[PDB]
Amino acid sequence: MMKRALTGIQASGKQHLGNYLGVMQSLIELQEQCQLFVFVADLHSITVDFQPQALKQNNFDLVRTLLAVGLDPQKACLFLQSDLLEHSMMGYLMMVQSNLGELQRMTQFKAKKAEQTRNPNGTLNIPTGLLTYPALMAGDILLYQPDIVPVGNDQKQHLELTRDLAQRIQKKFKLKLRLPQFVQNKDTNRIMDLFDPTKKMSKSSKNQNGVIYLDDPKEVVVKKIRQATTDSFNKIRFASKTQPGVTNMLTILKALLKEPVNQSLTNQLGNDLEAYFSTKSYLDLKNALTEATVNLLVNIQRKREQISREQVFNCLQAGKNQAQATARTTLALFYDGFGLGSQNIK
Amino acid sequence: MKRALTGIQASGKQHLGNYLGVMQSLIELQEQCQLFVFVADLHSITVDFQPQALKQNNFDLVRTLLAVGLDPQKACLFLQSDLLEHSMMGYLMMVQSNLGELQRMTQFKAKKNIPTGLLTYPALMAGDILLYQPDIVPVGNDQKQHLELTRDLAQRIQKKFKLKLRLPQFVQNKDTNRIMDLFDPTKKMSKSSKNQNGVIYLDDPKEVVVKKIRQATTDSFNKIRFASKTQPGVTNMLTILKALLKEPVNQSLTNQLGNDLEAYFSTKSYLDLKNALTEATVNLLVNIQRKREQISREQVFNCLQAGKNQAQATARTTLALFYDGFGLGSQNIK
Ligand SMILES: Nc1ncnc2c1ncn2[C@@H]1O[C@H](COS(=O)(=O)NC(=O)[C@@H](N)Cc2c[nH]c3ccccc23)[C@@H](O)[C@H]1O
Ligand SMILES: Nc1ncnc2c1ncn2[C@@H]1O[C@H](COS(=O)(=O)NC(=O)[C@@H](N)Cc2c[nH]c3ccccc23)[C@@H](O)[C@H]1O
């Protein structure tokens, strides 16, 4: 039977369109085609200073967003990473099997260790979790032995490190494993920042006019898009390389039109966006983008509100058990191969 | 009743330093307080290893420990890999630490293509301790820095999360917290040491221990006395001997030498000292392996099973308290 999918999402009041288009939107297709596993990666969130109050609120808020979006706990498995000690344990086996060198060359680590304060002596103060989390990820993946791992472009190096560790583990412990395959959305694998389209939309961006947050009110969405940096070539078409700004708004618009809401918008526009905007201004593009966007956000924020606390709890409670069903099986097999545990001596 | 907690890594290289440093006092500790002792295999996989040798070593260590007096009815003896709580508690300590702090560690700084675990384990050790809110952590002198890091993390989390914490207290045997290497008395006895003649292993046969001690380096003053700075060699052999005379097996010898070793060896030679140490060490090393076989593969497993349940009890209570403090888990919603 059925092919398996695993993916994790970090919670944050900064959840944005890059996240939605990157993985969330395709979640509804996945739970129909695969045995889908999805979790709130709160063990990745605490790798930097954080407020326990904020963490709790966010973990709750993410589950509601995923539900408001269509993730069905009857068709898929949605859990909270920290609810399973199996994650910390598997993450640990991965960590002891990695070396500092490979972890230090990670691009995300470089660009992140550079995102923080220096001690009085001038040296950088880097929480250890920033260096090691990519091993936790490898473990989160391998615990469910999935066929694919749907993620955004930015997560490619991590998938590679994970396959290297899987092969490393397989070679040394002769453990029967399945190499997880990296899978990204052909079109929306990397939504760009609206202010500086040469950078991806990030929760970490200082300037917020470049990020469309999932909890941004319509008036804010309107202003941000109206100010989206374009270019002075006045030509609406897909040209990532030469017109990052316009191209970005264009591929976002295309992805939003597939949504039920926006049915009228996509009908009014036709399937050939370039042909439609052929005789129109950049302002006409921002206008259409602002409508598809507002429509989507208002419909997420709408449904997201209907989801209740109890609902979140029961959901996570069932996911916990379900996910833990396959996590224990896998960890147990690794224990055998590693020689860990006491049920290894008669 | 106060609580104690300690970990020991399994290894065919188990030596006298490990025995006098921590093992020999377990008999007393399980009587004086709530003792938790575990085989630190999570720490053993921080460097390349063989899974078969690992299960074999973990098993052997439980035997040695049982054979030396650890009573499962008076203390809790378990394998840390059996508790997922360790990996989680250690993950929390880890994310609360920083690289400089860990790069400073003498072991790492003086041991650095490096296995990631070689850098992070002091944060795991910190977690192994904190998981049981012990009053004391009985270890050898060499673990001092680790306990200092544990206290630092403890206070850091206590201030950051308002968590009700009890800082662990580093405790070492005052006379045997640092057994020195027989070849080079300025260096402590270690498993890693490449000149194996300076290290008496718990499994070293009679003729081997005889040969190692007879060759123990001394000095040229011809004075048997406690004088570590000027005479590391004889002083180390002296503190080893005195410690061994406390064991039941060396009763006859104890009566012979008396309670004042400096007085006994007053009119003797270094050869005599070596001869006494040899008799005391052999009597110990052969007694231990004797009892070691009186321990079946079954007794070990059952001991670990009970230790697991007992240990998991307080470990789970401690972890839950950390969870509600870090805002982790599903129960923190509702
Ligand atoms: N601008 C962007 N465009 C498209 N996709 C984007 C994007 N910015 C972020 N994303 C994706 O949005 C998703 C969630 O963002 S995220 O929380 O930062 N993702 C992460 O931090 C992951 N490392 C979490 C994780 C931990 N273990 C895992 C195992 C499998 C998959 C993911 C994880 C990821 O798939 C990102 O790649
Ligand atoms: N030469 C020596 N003289 C006296 N004591 C010595 C010694 N050489 C080693 N020891 C002690 O022997 C005991 C076991 O040695 S050891 O396995 O190498 N110690 C370790 O590996 C520790 N990291 C084990 C550990 C993990 N988590 C812990 C939590 C609390 C206490 C210890 C641990 C420790 O207390 C050492 O300090």
CATH number of the domain bearing residue B213: 1.10.240.10
If you measure CA to CA, which chain A residue comes closest to B45? A96
Say if residue B221 is in the same domain as residue B168. Answer: no
Residues A113, A141 contacting (CB under 8 angstroms):
no
Give nearest CA residue, ligand 1 atom 25: A8
Q: How far apart are CA A131 and CA A105, in angstroms?
A: 10
Q: Name the residue range of residue A140's domain.
A: 1-190+310-346
**Same domain as B306, residue B248:** no
**Does B203 share its domain with B286?**
yes
Ligand 2 centre from B143 Cα, in Å? 6
A180 and A247, same domain (yes or no): no
B305 → chain A, closest CA residue: A342
Residues of B in contact with A105 (CB under 8 A): none
∠ CA B115-B118-B122, nearest 5°, is: 155
- Sign of CA pseudo-dihedral A150, B90, A336, B304: negative
Helix/strand/coil for A215: coil
Question: Cβ(A76)–Cβ(A318) under 8 Å?
Answer: no
Task: Give which of A63, A128, A308 to mutate to test B binding, by max B Cβ within 10 Å.
Answer: A128
Same domain, B157 and B22: yes
Instruction: Give, in order, the Cα–Cα distances in Å from B127 to each of A77, B49, B86.
Output: 31, 23, 7
Contact check, Cβ <8 Å, B94/A132: yes
The three-state DSSP-derived secondary structure of A63-104 is: HHHHHHHCCCCCCEEEEEHHHCHHHHHHHHHHHHCCEHHHHH
- Per the structure block, which two tokens stand in for A204? 């970490």
Domains held by chain B: number: 2
Query: Do A285 and A138 reside in the same domain of the chain?
Result: no
Give B-chain residues touching A86 at CB under 8 angstroms: 84
The beta strand positions in chain B, using DSSP E, are 3-8, 34-39, 75-79, 136-138, 169-171
Report chain B's terminal Cα–Cα distance, integer Å: 37
CATH number at residue A20: 3.40.50.620
Which positions of A are annotated as active-site residues? 112, 200, 203
* Same domain assignment for residues B168 and B194: no
Q: Crossing angle, helix B270-293 and helix B232-244, to 10 degrees?
A: 40
3-state secondary structure (DSSP) of residue A212? coil
CA A73 to chain centre: 18
d(CA B127, CA B147): 11
Find the DSSP H helices in B115-186: 117-130, 144-161
* Ligand closest in space to the Cα of A139: 1
**Quick one: which of A6, A5, A333 has its CA closest to A176?**
A333
Cβ–ligand 2 contact at B127 (below 6 Å): no
Q: Which of B41, B116, B330 sits opposite A132 (nearest CB)?
A: B116
Closest among A293, A217, A282 to A257, alpha carbons compared: A293
The structure's method of determination equals: X-ray
Interchain pair A82, B334: CB under 8 A: no
- Do both A217 and A154 map to the same domain? no
A200 and A151 in one domain? Answer: no
Ligand 1 binding pocket includes A40 (Cβ within 6 Å): no
Task: Please check whether residues B7 and B25 belong to one and the same domain.
Answer: yes
Question: Rounded to 5 degrees, what are φ and ψ at B171?
Answer: -135, 125
Give the number of A-B residue pairs with CB atoms closer than 8 Å: 149
Q: CB of B6 closer than 6 A to ligand 2?
A: yes
Residues A253 and A150 in one domain: no
Contact across the interface for B119 and A100, Cβ inside 8 Å: yes
Q: Kindly state whether residues B258 and B305 are assigned to the same domain.
A: no
d(CA B334, CA B320): 16
Q: Are the C-beta atoms of residues A284 and A277 closer than 8 Å to each other?
A: yes
Residues on chain B touching A60 (C-beta within 8 angstroms): 333
Report whether residue A38 contacts ligand 1, using a CB cutoff of 6 Å.
Answer: no
Contacts of A43 (CB under 8 A, 6+ apart): A81, A82, A87, A88, A91, A136, B91, B328
